Amino acid sequence: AQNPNCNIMIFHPTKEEFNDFDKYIAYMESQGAHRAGLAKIIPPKEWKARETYDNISEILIATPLQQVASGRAGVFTQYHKKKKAMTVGEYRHLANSKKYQTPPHQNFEDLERKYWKNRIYNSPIYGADISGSLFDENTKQWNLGHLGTIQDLLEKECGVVIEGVNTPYLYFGMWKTTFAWHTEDMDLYSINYLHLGEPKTWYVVPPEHGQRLERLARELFPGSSRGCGAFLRHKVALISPTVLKENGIPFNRITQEAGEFMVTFPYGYHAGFNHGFNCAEAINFATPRWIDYGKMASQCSCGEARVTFSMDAFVRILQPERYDLWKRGQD
């Protein structure tokens, strides 16, 4: 078996290898990349997402989210308080202000230490979940707005035609902005391109060990667990690498820099944080190997999770028994 220790693998495709997206994902998996739950892909030196980022300041963040923590430094939840709209230019200025700016630090490791020590004592503002794309329409390779759709994948694999669309989302971040432990909707893949700015650090649990993380989460957030059989779907729980280690949970970490892609694989739990002002673009996608994960994906039915229009069809076709109780939660 390839990659038996489930290490995060890093790939350097040539420009020729960068032409066929599906083929390259399949290649990475042939080398065992999916066992980690996360892979890094460094694009060929000849490639670019767009010519410049000099003209993005007038993008609107309609609903910036203030991420307020509760709990202890290594085990906490965060809730999202809605703030007034601001442009990306205004957001960048806010990120760089004394209140919100990245502190002096020696290296990535020092900054990671500071994050886990001090995150709960601040409430950074995240410009997350904004429909749109920053890829130039003329960028033909790995353009996250031009991928084959999940609906078409299901149709090719299973012969059923379904409603729904999937499009990319932009994420504007600042120091300490945080993504909670989660897998993707319907345990899909995700792909994430860091367009500009400061790094993003990721933590990931191998898919084969995801249930170990779930068991620890139930122990650490007992009220939440009683309220919902899949509460990690709420995307509000954080557990530090120190706490994961203390509890013997297998995981890895890696830092993504501007100009790099990350792919998360079906049922690969991940969490992380931004180092300073940045912008990422991400979208879900599927392959033939995903179908069996989609069939088995846990669902939140307490109603907190509340997901996309397109998820309806996935649950309806892949999980017909659940579909009744699930849509009861969505509605």
Ligand X SMILES: CC(=O)c1ccc(O)cc1
Ligand Y SMILES: O=C(O)CNC(=O)C(=O)O
Q: Binding site residues for Zn(2+), as ranges?
A: 228, 234, 300, 302
Q: Is 78 in the site for ligand Y (CB under 6 A)?
A: no
Cα–Cα distance, 77 to 82 (Å, whole number): 16
Cα–Cα distance, 81 to 58 (Å, whole number): 23
Cα–Cα distance, 99 to 77 (Å, whole number): 22
Q: Is 92 in the site for ligand X (CB under 6 A)?
A: yes
Least Cβ distance, residue 284 to Ni ion (angstroms): 8
Partner whose binding site includes residue 264, from ligand Y, ligand X, Zn ion, none (CB under 5 to 8 Å by kind): ligand Y
Give the CA angle between residues 106, 111, 114 to the nearest 5°: 120
Give the chain's end-to-end CA distance (angstroms, integer).
44
Q: Is 136 in the site for ligand X (CB under 6 A)?
A: yes
Given the complex with ligand X, which of 54 and 321 has the nearer CB atom?
54
Phi, psi of 282 (to 5 degrees): -145, 155
Sign of CA pseudo-dihedral 44, 204, 251, 292: negative
Q: Is 282 in the site for ligand Y (CB under 6 A)?
A: yes
Cα–Cα distance, 310 to 325 (Å, whole number): 17
Stretch in the footprint of Ni ion (CB under 5 A) among 24-32, 42-50, 115-123, 190-198: 190-198
Q: Is 196 in the site for ligand X (CB under 6 A)?
A: yes
Kindly tell me which residue out of 106, 107, 131, 138 binds ligand X, with binding defined by CB under 6 A.
138
Kindly tell me which residue out of 50, 80, 218, 235 binds ligand X, with binding defined by CB under 6 A.
50
Q: Is-contact 201 255, C-beta < 8 A?
A: yes
Annotated binding site for 2-oxoglutarate: 126, 192, 200, 235
Q: Is 75 in the site for ligand X (CB under 6 A)?
A: no
Residue nearest to Ni ion (CB): 190
Stretch in the footprint of ligand X (CB under 6 A) among 131-139, 176-184, 222-230, 314-322: 131-139
Q: Is-contact 187 297, C-beta < 8 A?
A: yes
Stretch in the footprint of ligand X (CB under 6 A) among 49-57, 184-192, 266-274, 285-293: 49-57
Kindly tell me which residue out of 48, 80, 218, 316 binds ligand X, with binding defined by CB under 6 A.
48
Three-class SS of residue 125?
strand
Given the complex with Zn ion, which of 56 and 238 has the nearer CB atom?
238
By CB atoms closer than 10 A (0-12, 13-18, 19+), residue 127 is: buried
Q: Is 300 in the site for Zn ion (CB under 5 A)?
A: yes
Kindly tell me which residue out of 91, 100, 175, 179 binds ligand Y, with binding defined by CB under 6 A.
179
Closest CA to 119 of 95, 97, 103, 96: 103
How many CB atoms are closer than 10 A to CB 201?
17
Residues near ligand Y (CB under 6 A), total: 9
Kindly tell me which residue out of 130, 154, 228, 249 binds Zn ion, with binding defined by CB under 5 A.
228
Q: Is 301 in the site for ligand Y (CB under 6 A)?
A: no
* Helix ranges restricted to H, 129-209: 150-158
Given the complex with ligand Y, which of 264 and 298 has the nearer CB atom?
264
* Helix ranges restricted to H, the chain: 21-30, 88-95, 108-118, 150-158, 210-220, 222-227, 241-246, 290-296, 311-318, 320-330
Q: Is 94 in the site for ligand X (CB under 6 A)?
A: no
Stretch in the footprint of ligand X (CB under 6 A) among 10-18, 44-52, 226-234, 319-327: 44-52
Binding site for Ni ion (CB under 5 A): 190
Binding site for Zn ion (CB under 5 A): 228, 300, 302, 304
